[PDB]
Each structure stands twice: as structure tokens, then as C-alpha cells.
Amino acid sequence: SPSKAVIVPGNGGGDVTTHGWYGWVKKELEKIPGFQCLAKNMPDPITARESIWLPFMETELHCDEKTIIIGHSSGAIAAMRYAETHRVYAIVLVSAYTSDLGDENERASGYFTRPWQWEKIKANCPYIVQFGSTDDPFLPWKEQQEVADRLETKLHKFTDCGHFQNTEFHELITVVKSLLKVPALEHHHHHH
After folding, report:
1. For 3, what's the count of Cα atoms within 13 Å in the CB-facing half-sphere?
2. Domain total in the chain
3. What is the DSSP letter of 86?
4. 135 a catalytic residue
5. CA 165/CA 10 separation, integer angstroms
6. What one-character DSSP code corresponds to residue 184?
7. Which CATH number is 102's domain given?
8. Catalytic residue selected from 72, 73, 86, 109
């Protein structure tokens, strides 16, 4: 049973409470009786180092087996790596990808220095939902598709949402509410 949602933003100095759609979503989720939504500015906001973000997610955002982690861009990457070694109720990935995109700041994060442990993630997180747009100026659809295929995510594919940098996100609320009802699990494939 999920007790809270935690928002892990993409990299950048923007204050999480007033940048992008994080704040609006947090307020909408807080309208749900008995629910909570945590969103805090991340340590090392620019480079989003894995060695910094994951420990923060564990002790400061208290990401556990009763948490729905909503990760955006770098935050989606962080949630995926987090799920390789931690059990989580669900992860909602917004604008996920798989490589450093040949970008030095992405490489500096340390998230892409080795292959993705897809099966471990799939085993540690029963519900993986994904939002992605084919017109994302930052990411090649191929990589968003790779995440969808390897994690067998429930994909919400759009064509005009870019990198999801608007201020409201109703569809995300609908997803979180569906997760709170604990939907029936779909037939997936787990391997060694």
C-alpha cells in the first residue's frame, strides 16, 4: 500500500516547488485524503551525481516499499538506478532514457557508466509507468523506447509534450490515483 509519492526532478538549479510541473502536481496529490507528496531541492542539482542523489532519496526523501517515485529526466534515471537495489511500490518515469547522450554533464553524473540492470529493476518495482513524447528535443525516442521495452512499462506516449516542461500535468495525477487503487498486475517476463 503506497503511503506517499516522492518527486525527483531533472537536473538544474530551478527550485522544485516553483519550477516546471512539480509544484502543481505536489498540490494536487496533497488534495488526496491521507496521502503525502515530498518534493525537495536536490543536493548537487546541476550534475545530479548518482553518489549524491540516491543516498538523499533514501534518507531525506525516505524512498521505500510504500513509495511511488515520480522521476523526471535525471530524476527518472535516478529512480531507475535506485530500483536496482531498493524495493519500491511504483516508479513513474517522465522522459526516461538510457545513455549519457554524448553529453559531458550527463556523463559526469555517473548514471551511465555501466549497463542497466533491467531485470533487477523489474523485480524490485511491481508497477513501472512511463511518460514520453516523440518531440522531446533532449532525447532520442529510441532510448525512451528502450526503457519501455526493457522494463515493460505502461507507456503513455505523446507527440507534443516535449521534455515535459509545462506547469500542469493532469494525466500524471490520474496515473498516481490509479496506482493508489492497486490495479491488477499485468503479465510480464522476468529473467535471470
Report:
1. 6
2. 1
3. S
4. no
5. 10
6. P
7. 3.40.50.1820
8. 73
